[PDB]
Amino acid sequence: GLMQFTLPVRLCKEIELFHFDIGPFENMWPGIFVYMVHRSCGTSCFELEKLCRFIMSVKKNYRRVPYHNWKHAVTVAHCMYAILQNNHTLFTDLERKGLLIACLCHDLDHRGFSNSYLQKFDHPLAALYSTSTMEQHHFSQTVSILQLEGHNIFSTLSSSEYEQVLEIIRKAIIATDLALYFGNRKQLEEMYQTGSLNLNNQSHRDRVIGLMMTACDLCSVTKLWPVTKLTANDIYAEFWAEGDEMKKLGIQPIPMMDRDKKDEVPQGQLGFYNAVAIPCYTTLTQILPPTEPLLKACRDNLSQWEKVIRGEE
């Protein structure tokens, strides 16, 4: 109760910034997450023993894949921490509790394959969940772990508060399905620009949290260039393995997943920043002005990919 997590000075200062990298010391990531829960939510939000036990079960249920791993989960939660800390008064007590947990859980038991590969392989999960296949799986795994004995971190919430927090987590995790992002941001764009956006409207909050989830999920493009560049290798290493698996089913993969088209990566990154990243952080910055450093960082990394194409690196 009088037991705070503290971090070394460089981490204590840099963890508050959007571009913070959680580092290569896996054993410090749980501590980092608890630190962020404590400052973002309070030392009273969760029973430390339950929270620690929940964090270690979540870690255990992330797999050793190149990108969609326990490091990604903690990275996505740290970006959410930075958004929440820079927008103190916009979020409910329940939202603050649920969104860091949603972020830590959002890719639980990912196998390194897209929804599309599960459907073409005819994976059991593709019969159980027809759309947002992996994301319904991630939420299902979150509920499983919350129901392990001694793992119910929400035990002190009322029956209806409990139902609301699980409903925030569910919508937040579903929103990390990038297929849903394009329409969600188009609607948020229209609402902001016609002045109809209203944060007392629960369906509007839902959309805004969906956009925050895309922002945190893609936050590799908002890091220092060397972090962005080395993360992009992990991202493509999964896509190229999926491409190999597509070729095994007798299907030419899309170029994104074809390791034979490595040379075109710099141009694929431009399309991605222009079609997905920049629009995401732009609308986010319009809705939550203090999130501007994410947009600014993303624009800097777009300019670094432009330099790569111009053979200036």
Ligand SMILES: Cc1ncc(C)n2nc(CCc3nc(C4CCCC4)cn3C)nc12
């Ligand atoms: C940086 C980043 N973060 C998150 C996600 C989901 N992605 N997806 C990507 C792929 C971006 C792309 N490359 C290509 C290929 C390049 C070689 C042939 C074409 C196509 N396209 C869309 N980059 C990211």
Ligand SMILES: [Mg+2]
């Ligand atoms: Mg995902």
Ligand SMILES: [Zn+2]
């Ligand atoms: Zn993710």
